[PDB]
Amino acid sequence: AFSAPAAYLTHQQKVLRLYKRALRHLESWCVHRDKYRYFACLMRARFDEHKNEKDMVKATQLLRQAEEEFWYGQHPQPYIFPESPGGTSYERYECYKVPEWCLDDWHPSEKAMYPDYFAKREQWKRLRRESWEREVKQLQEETPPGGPRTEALPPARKEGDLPPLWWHIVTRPRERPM
Amino acid sequence: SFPKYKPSRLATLPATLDPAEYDISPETRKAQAERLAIRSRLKREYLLQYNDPNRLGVIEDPALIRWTYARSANIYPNFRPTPKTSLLGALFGIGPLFFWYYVFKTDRDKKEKLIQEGKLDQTFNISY
Amino acid sequence: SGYTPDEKLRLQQLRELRRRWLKDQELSPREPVLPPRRVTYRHSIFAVTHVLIPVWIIHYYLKYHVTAKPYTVVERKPRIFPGDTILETGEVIPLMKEFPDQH
Amino acid sequence: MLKIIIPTTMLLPMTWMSKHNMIWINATVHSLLISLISLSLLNQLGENSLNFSLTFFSDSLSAPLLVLTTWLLPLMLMASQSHLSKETTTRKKLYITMLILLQLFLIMTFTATELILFYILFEATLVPTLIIITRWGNQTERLNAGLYFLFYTLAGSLPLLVALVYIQNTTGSLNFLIIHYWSHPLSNSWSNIFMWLACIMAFMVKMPLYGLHLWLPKAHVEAPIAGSMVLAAVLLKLGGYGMMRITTILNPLTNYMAYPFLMLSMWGMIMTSSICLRQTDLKSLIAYSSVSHMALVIVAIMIQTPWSFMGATALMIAHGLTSSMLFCLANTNYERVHSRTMILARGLQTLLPLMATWWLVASLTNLALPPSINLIGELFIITASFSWSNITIILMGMNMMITALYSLYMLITTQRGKYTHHINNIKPSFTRENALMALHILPLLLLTLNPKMILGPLY
Amino acid sequence: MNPFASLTLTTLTILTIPIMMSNSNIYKTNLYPNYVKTTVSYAFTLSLVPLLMFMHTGQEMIISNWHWMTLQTVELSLSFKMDYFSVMFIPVALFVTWSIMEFSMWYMHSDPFINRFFKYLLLFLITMMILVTANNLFQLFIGWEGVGIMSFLLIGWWHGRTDANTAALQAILYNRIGDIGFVLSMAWFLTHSNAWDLQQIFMLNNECPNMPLIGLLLAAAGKSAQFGLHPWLPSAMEGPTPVSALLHSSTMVVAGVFLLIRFYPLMETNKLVQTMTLCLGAITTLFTALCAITQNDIKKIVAFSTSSQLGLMMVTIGINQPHLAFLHICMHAFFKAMLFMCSGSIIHSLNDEQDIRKMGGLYKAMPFTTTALIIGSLALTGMPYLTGFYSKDLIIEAVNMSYTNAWALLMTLIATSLTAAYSTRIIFFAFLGKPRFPPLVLINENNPLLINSIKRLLIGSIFAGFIISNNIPPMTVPNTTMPLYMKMTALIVTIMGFMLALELNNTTYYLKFKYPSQTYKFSNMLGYYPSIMHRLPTYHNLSMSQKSASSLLDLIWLETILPKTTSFIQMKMSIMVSNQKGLIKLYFLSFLITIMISMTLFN
Amino acid sequence: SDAPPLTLEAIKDRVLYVLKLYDKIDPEKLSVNSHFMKDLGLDSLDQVEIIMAMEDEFGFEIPDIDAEKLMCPQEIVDYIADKKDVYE
Numbered sequence A: 001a002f003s004a005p006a007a008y009l010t011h012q013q014k015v016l017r018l019y020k021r022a023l024r025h026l027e028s029w030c031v032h033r034d035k036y037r038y039f040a041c042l043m044r045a046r047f048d049e050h051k052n053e054k055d056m057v058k059a060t061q062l063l064r065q066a067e068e069e070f071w072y073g074q075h076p077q078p079y080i081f082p083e084s085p086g087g088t089s090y091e092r093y094e095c096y097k098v099p100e101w102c103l104d105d106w107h108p109s110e111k112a113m114y115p116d117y118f119a120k121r122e123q124w125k126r127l128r129r130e131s132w133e134r135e136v137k138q139l140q141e142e143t144p145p146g147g148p149r150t151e152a153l154p155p156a157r158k159e160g161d162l163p164p165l166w167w168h169i170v171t172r173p174r175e176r177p178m
Numbered sequence B: 001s002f003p004k005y006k007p008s009r010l011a012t013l014p015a016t017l018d019p020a021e022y023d024i025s026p027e028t029r030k031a032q033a034e035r036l037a038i039r040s041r042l043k044r045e046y047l048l049q050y051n052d053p054n055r056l057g058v059i060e061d062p063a064l065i066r067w068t069y070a071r072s073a074n075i076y077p078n079f080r081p082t083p084k085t086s087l088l089g090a091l092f093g094i095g096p097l098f099f100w101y102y103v104f105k106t107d108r109d110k111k112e113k114l115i116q117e118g119k120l121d122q123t124f125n126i127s128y
Numbered sequence C: 001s002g003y004t005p006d007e008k009l010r011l012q013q014l015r016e017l018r019r020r021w022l023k024d025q026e027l028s029p030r031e032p033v034l035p036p037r038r039v040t041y042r043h044s045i046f047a048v049t050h051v052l053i054p055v056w057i058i059h060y061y062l063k064y065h066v067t068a069k070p071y072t073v074v075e076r077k078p079r080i081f082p083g084d085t086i087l088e089t090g091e092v093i094p095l096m097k098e099f100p101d102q103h
Numbered sequence D: 001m002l003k004i005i006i007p008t009t010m011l012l013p014m015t016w017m018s019k020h021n022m023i024w025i026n027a028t029v030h031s032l033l034i035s036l037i038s039l040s041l042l043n044q045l046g047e048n049s050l051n052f053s054l055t056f057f058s059d060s061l062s063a064p065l066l067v068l069t070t071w072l073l074p075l076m077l078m079a080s081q082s083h084l085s086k087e088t089t090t091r092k093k094l095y096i097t098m099l100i101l102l103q104l105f106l107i108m109t110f111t112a113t114e115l116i117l118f119y120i121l122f123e124a125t126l127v128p129t130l131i132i133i134t135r136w137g138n139q140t141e142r143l144n145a146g147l148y149f150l151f152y153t154l155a156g157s158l159p160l161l162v163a164l165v166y167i168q169n170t171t172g173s174l175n176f177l178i179i180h181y182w183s184h185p186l187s188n189s190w191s192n193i194f195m196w197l198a199c200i201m202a203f204m205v206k207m208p209l210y211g212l213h214l215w216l217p218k219a220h221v222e223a224p225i226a227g228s229m230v231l232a233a234v235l236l237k238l239g240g241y242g243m244m245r246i247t248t249i250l251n252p253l254t255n256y257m258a259y260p261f262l263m264l265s266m267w268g269m270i271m272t273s274s275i276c277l278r279q280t281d282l283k284s285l286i287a288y289s290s291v292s293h294m295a296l297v298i299v300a301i302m303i304q305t306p307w308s309f310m311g312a313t314a315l316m317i318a319h320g321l322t323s324s325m326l327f328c329l330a331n332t333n334y335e336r337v338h339s340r341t342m343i344l345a346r347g348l349q350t351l352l353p354l355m356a357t358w359w360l361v362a363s364l365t366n367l368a369l370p371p372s373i374n375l376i377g378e379l380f381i382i383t384a385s386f387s388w389s390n391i392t393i394i395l396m397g398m399n400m401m402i403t404a405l406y407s408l409y410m411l412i413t414t415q416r417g418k419y420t421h422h423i424n425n426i427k428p429s430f431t432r433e434n435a436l437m438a439l440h441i442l443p444l445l446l447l448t449l450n451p452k453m454i455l456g457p458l459y
Numbered sequence E: 001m002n003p004f005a006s007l008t009l010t011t012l013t014i015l016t017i018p019i020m021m022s023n024s025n026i027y028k029t030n031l032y033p034n035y036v037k038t039t040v041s042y043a044f045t046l047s048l049v050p051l052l053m054f055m056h057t058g059q060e061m062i063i064s065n066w067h068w069m070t071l072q073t074v075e076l077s078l079s080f081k082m083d084y085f086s087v088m089f090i091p092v093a094l095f096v097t098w099s100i101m102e103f104s105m106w107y108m109h110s111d112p113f114i115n116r117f118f119k120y121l122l123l124f125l126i127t128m129m130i131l132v133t134a135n136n137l138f139q140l141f142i143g144w145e146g147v148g149i150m151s152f153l154l155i156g157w158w159h160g161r162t163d164a165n166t167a168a169l170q171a172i173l174y175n176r177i178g179d180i181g182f183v184l185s186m187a188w189f190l191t192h193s194n195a196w197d198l199q200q201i202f203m204l205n206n207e208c209p210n211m212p213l214i215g216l217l218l219a220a221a222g223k224s225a226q227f228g229l230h231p232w233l234p235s236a237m238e239g240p241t242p243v244s245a246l247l248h249s250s251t252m253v254v255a256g257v258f259l260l261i262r263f264y265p266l267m268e269t270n271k272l273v274q275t276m277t278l279c280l281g282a283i284t285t286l287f288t289a290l291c292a293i294t295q296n297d298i299k300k301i302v303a304f305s306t307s308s309q310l311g312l313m314m315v316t317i318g319i320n321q322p323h324l325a326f327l328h329i330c331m332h333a334f335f336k337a338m339l340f341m342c343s344g345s346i347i348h349s350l351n352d353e354q355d356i357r358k359m360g361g362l363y364k365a366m367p368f369t370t371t372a373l374i375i376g377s378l379a380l381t382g383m384p385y386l387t388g389f390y391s392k393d394l395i396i397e398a399v400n401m402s403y404t405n406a407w408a409l410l411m412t413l414i415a416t417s418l419t420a421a422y423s424t425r426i427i428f429f430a431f432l433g434k435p436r437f438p439p440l441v442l443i444n445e446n447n448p449l450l451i452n453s454i455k456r457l458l459i460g461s462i463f464a465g466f467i468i469s470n471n472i473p474p475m476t477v478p479n480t481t482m483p484l485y486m487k488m489t490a491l492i493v494t495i496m497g498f499m500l501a502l503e504l505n506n507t508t509y510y511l512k513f514k515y516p517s518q519t520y521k522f523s524n525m526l527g528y529y530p531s532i533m534h535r536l537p538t539y540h541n542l543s544m545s546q547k548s549a550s551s552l553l554d555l556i557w558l559e560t561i562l563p564k565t566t567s568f569i570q571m572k573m574s575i576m577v578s579n580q581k582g583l584i585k586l587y588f589l590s591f592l593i594t595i596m597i598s599m600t601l602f603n
Numbered sequence F: 001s002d003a004p005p006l007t008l009e010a011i012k013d014r015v016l017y018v019l020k021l022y023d024k025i026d027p028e029k030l031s032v033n034s035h036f037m038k039d040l041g042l043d044s045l046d047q048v049e050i051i052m053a054m055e056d057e058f059g060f061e062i063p064d065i066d067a068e069k070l071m072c073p074q075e076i077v078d079y080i081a082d083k084k085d086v087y088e
């Protein structure tokens, strides 16, 4: 999620992803813990038979018939964690996520309550404001000519600098705002 | 061997079952690198416009304007009378009208004939 | 694999900034500064403000307005059985035909 | 009837002589007072009509339309007061003058004891609307829209005038009362067929019919908020009023000639309801919904039964109010967003809950939820069509299903989901917008208590 | 005078006071849910009086209080019907709703908009009470639409979730499909019987034709989620557990069945519609049970069980036993609501975990939920002298001892077996094995609200069947004589299902793994009906709505015919006429030609 | 919910507990900053098994792109703390 994607997936990444999917779907098939442990160790042994293989064409032939076999026996109703992109509580709390700038439109009678919070917010806004001009310059001087090649942002290199484009990553509402 | 999965329009081919992915080549790698470079440039532009504290408005999205304009205002100037278009327009704009006209006309002539012969039993039929 | 050193440093800085923001989200003990300004017993009052008054209003509206017009309230004409007597008339429904009673 | 017309005429001098910062207040107050005055026309009789004089008369079909027309002006002023803030005093007074002239023309049109006077006012209502659309419009296409909104209308209305005068040469009077009392059957002839067409298509073009509905999306999209309100709420009902007034002399030729228009409306309601499903514009979607509802009204009028007429009147009133509310909500979104696209701004219920409630109520009343008068009119028309022929129920039910689908689609796309991240200029809704929504919605839920007030003369 | 009317209107009237007070100050405090729960409990204990009067005397009423618009010879008025059905269903619904709000007090403890949730629940209850007591078709339609709109609002309670909005729109779509038939029935009844009142409709239809009954059957299939329009009920589990327990399990989803109960005088005079109803119920219950017996989400299993019970109710209606179907509604509300409450308690205890693969040993970890779920499953499958027996046993006997179709009876028996199968599946997979939840144990039941709400419905699910069966008057001829084997058909079928499903489930412990068969894939994917029917039609509609309706006709051909052709013709004629080079020779020659033509043509 | 507000101390305690139950690692040789591929001599498949253990222990699944580049327990606790927004 946080880490920037790569231009492509290597063979080891693909085999690791297949291993993850196969073990998860095997756990979905094998409800009980001991049965899952036995069959997962059996699957690990089946996977590590060809670990030391060197031929790239034969390696590509491998993992492909494995993906086909996985698709044939992929447990059409697999287990999904509640907050996962397929879970029952994937986006339950997205209706309670309110942006930070909404507080700028509060009535003064509402800002009369919670004065310390708005003072700290003022310090945060000043820090963002002073910081922003420098961040743009860093991005301008650090970005390779011809535009970025990978959507990875550099860290702050000086003392008083801050990571470029940090405001909307630091100011996420919450995971469970209410 | 196992039974083969057959792709369809509403059930597309899985990502891990595409024969094209496993046919890796330097040209394909270069194409993917260029695609990711384009995506990275667009994302960098969007974030530069997004994190700016001075901005107090929406960020105009030329893709969205292009989509809406092509959907609404760019249809007729690119239209050409073609046997496909002429036939499809005639069908979908004339056939249903005549079909429903025939259906309702047949039903109403049947009802009128039954009324004229008097064998309809319209007792308690007061509101119309 | 793993994090690159620049990724490590950026994650560290962003994480410390996020922790500072989260700590700043907390409330002081005086934060809700509420300004004050004005201008069996629970069940006992509830049963008279939520039941008794609605029954009074509905009973009045039914007995004195709805029943004024004809056919607004129609009964079922309760069942009449042999051996019963009617209050209005006082006459007694005659008994049945004395079928043979056995088991 | 002059007790309503004269104050509307005095609204002009008052606006011009009004202080440079007090035009809106005076206009709103006096327009609301005039609406209160016009409320008295609802007291109708089971007898003929309220014949005030030789020139103007009232009826229980004209009375609800007159009340709605008088009520719309304060809402139009409240909606227009927002986007005309940076505008010079003379031109704001000109805008208010156009609104007042349109209201006066509509009020005189809805009484119109004579058909030539009705035609004159019915075509006089065109000029202020065209000026409003082509002057105070945002996009460059407004001019084109105006042209369309003009010529279509005239393309239908010029033959009507000829037919009208021809009738006066044969009948001898175009007065509605004499025309009703001295009506004679139309022989099935080519000349009578063409006279029927000349009398009918003028009102069919403004409803609009499915074939002749092209001008409406353009006119509604490019017009300002007040123009959209007046077009959707009142100007579409002129065709229905004219048809109900003029179909008396068209019998018995109406039975044969109603078939093409009945088929066109019964299929175009489905076509426009389906078009609403795939739409990237809020105003266009509302316009197509208006087209569908007016197609149902056309079916009702062509069926020509008492239940048909009652449902038609109720549906016109309800649709006017509902479409005005929907356009107002869309304009409130646009004034913050400046894009007028459904998919751009999302999840507004999180940021504006009360406006989300207003959106929900508007969508529900457009969905024809009972016991709203929308449902009353729809059900009366459906029952009359079923009596006309039992097979219409399939198309009617399909239309109801697609209507519910696109209404809830409009609600969910704009109110539910996750908010757009980069949009930060979404300020809290003002008291004016909320008051506009409340003043739009409360009359509907009050009229559902007294349906007979809007059921027309055949009640 | 005659307190029956005053009480039976006062219950519904006092059900609406918290809606009035929702704009008051109490709505902004945390005592609002307690206010609503107390109001509902008082309404239930107040409605217990008309039930007592009916049981004593058999007293029935019609209260036509307010006069709405009158349309020529048709009169519309606010009329309430207080027959056996209304005065019996109101107390059960109020009891279930009281239990549901008491449970939601604890289940929605952390929800910021809990007062709005309770207001929505009360509004749904008000709309359902309007639906049940309606005496004319317009008021019944008002309730029909109110319950649907409230279901739409409550399914999409978490409006930030895409799937919740999708499920709400799905439910609206299917309910409008039923609305088509409902409106058809209304139109036919007004056109032919000249009224929407129940009395006039019953009087003027001695032999009811096919069309109004087919419309009523379509509406009932739409609202009760029969086989043709089933998937919306499984998909409605996206809403909060109290919503699934109240609306989509016990009260709202029976409404369509109730409709067919209301028109039973017209139902018995038609044979084709009865056969259609019986076949639809049989196929629905079979298909839903078969889909249920292989699901992993507990809420999905309970919803499919509810749909199977609805199919059984429709079969009972089809075999000309409306009163028995009403009794089944009454018992099913009790035990299915309590079952859903147990499911919600388990769900909350395991940190919002719904799949049964992560639920292990709970027989000892949570005992009260265990005993409540066991009692509920026993009542649902049918244990003699329990609340489910007095209904389902008579259902089976009536099906066996009457002139029906063989296939419908076979599918009813197989559906009973599959009901036992999924009940034992739930119990085995959720209560018997070793624990499989995450290590951080947060299991807790020490809360009086949940315990009281569950135990009230427990006492109901144990005693209410006997009390109600022995209290109501006899409404049908009993099957007093029976074959000995056919007397025990339901019991042996249920026991066989229990034993076979337990034996099949016990083989999961075996250290052997085999790929699934085609039948398992068909049953797990809901017969593949949700895939095809939610991908093939919709696309084929939406595409058309942009290709033919929007672009081809509206934007191109309708534009080409009238405006564009006129513009092109006028432009061409203007160009031709105005393009004169200014040479007087050509104009003079044209004038000479015109003079010659005038001299040679106009004389 | 009624869920206690877990802290990084608890998260690191649970992570180290899960790693100590891993019999392939000697508990007395493991450390908070101990690397997986080098300091503990673990294969990539063992790393993804550790990721699975963390997912089944914390009740949420880490995306594969983030999981495949987590190399020490300290980064795992840091990532989980960022995911759950842990204060102290």
Ligand SMILES: CCCCCCCCCCCCCCCCCC(=O)OC[C@H](COP(=O)([O-])OCC(O)COP(=O)([O-])OC[C@@H](COC(=O)CCCCCCCCCCCCCCCCC)OC(=O)CCCCCCCCCCCCCCCCC)OC(=O)CCCCCCCCCCCCCCCCC
Pocket (backbone or CB within 6 Å): E293, E294, E410, E413, E414, E417, E418, E421, E425, E493, E497, E500, E501, E504, E508, E514, E515, E516, E517, E518, E519, E520, E523
């Ligand atoms: C007159 C005397 C009366 C007495 C008669 C005799 C008494 C009873 C005799 C017993 C007869 C059979 C009973 C055994 C049932 C089978 C259970 C079984 O072994 O399942 C495992 C086995 C496969 O397991 P798996 O794939 O390895 O699953 C992996 C794990 O187990 C995954 O496991 P999991 O943890 O995920 O979940 C486990 C779950 C998942 O298991 C499943 O996958 C369920 C799927 C099969 C079971 C469903 C059986 C219900 C049959 C209703 C069909 C109605 C007609 C449908 C028409 C379809 C047309 C294509 O299994 C269960 O929980 C229990 C399943 C249901 C068994 C208990 C109730 C059934 C007994 C009642 C049947 C008749 C007695 C009625 C009594 C009334 C007196 C008349 O199922 C089968 O091999 C199928 C066996 C029978 C299926 C017949 C349908 C075949 C349709 C093909 C085409 C046919 C021609 C159509 C031509 C159309 C052209 C137009």
Ligand SMILES: CCCCCCCCCCCCCCCCC[C@@H](O)O[C@H](CO[C@H](O)CCCCCCCCCCCCCCC)COP(=O)(O)OCC[N+](C)(C)C
Pocket (backbone or CB within 6 Å): D188, D189, D190, D193, D210, D211, D212, D260, D261
């Ligand atoms: C484009 C979007 C919609 C716009 C509006 C469209 C609706 C307008 C259509 C008008 C309705 C049809 C016009 C005439 C209908 C009369 C009935 C006729 O169709 O039936 C037969 C008529 O026979 C033939 O139709 C003869 C006419 C054929 C010539 C018409 C052209 C046909 C297609 C042209 C359509 C173009 C219309 C739009 C022009 C701009 C019956 O034969 P007969 O009993 O002997 O005649 C009875 C009438 N009498 C008694 C007066 C003599």
Ligand SMILES: CCCCCCCC/C=C\CCCCCCCC(=O)O[C@H](COC(=O)CCCCCCC/C=C/CCCCCCCC)COP(=O)(O)OCCN
Pocket (backbone or CB within 6 Å): D152, D155, D156, D159, D162, D163, D166, D190, D191, D192, D194, D195, D196, D197, D198, D199, D201, D202, D205, D212
């Ligand atoms: C939005 C665009 C819609 C355009 C509307 C056009 C439809 C109206 C019909 C065409 C115009 C006809 C106007 C006639 C006015 C009524 C007068 C009348 O009917 O009197 C007839 C006259 O009838 C006619 O002359 C009509 C002839 C039509 C001439 C103009 C043709 C215009 C185009 C016709 C084709 C289109 C037909 C359908 C158009 C529908 C619109 C799409 C009797 O004549 P007498 O000599 O007095 O009889 C003595 C012997 N008994």
Ligand SMILES: CCCCCCCCCCCC(=O)SCCNC(=O)CCNC(=O)[C@H](O)C(C)(C)COP(=O)(O)O
Pocket (backbone or CB within 6 Å): A011, A012, A013, A015, A022, A025, A026, A029, A046, A047, A048, A049, A050, A051, A052, A053, A054, A059, A060, A062, A063, A064, A066, A067, A069, A070, A073, A074, A075, F043, F044, F045
């Ligand atoms: C119920 C679901 C059924 C699913 C069925 C799935 C069937 C699986 C069968 C698998 C068959 C194979 O072995 S396919 C074998 C694919 N080819 C290779 O593995 C060659 C080189 N392998 C690598 O480089 C890896 O990364 C490795 C060294 C292993 C680790 O590396 P790390 O050092 O970075 O951990």
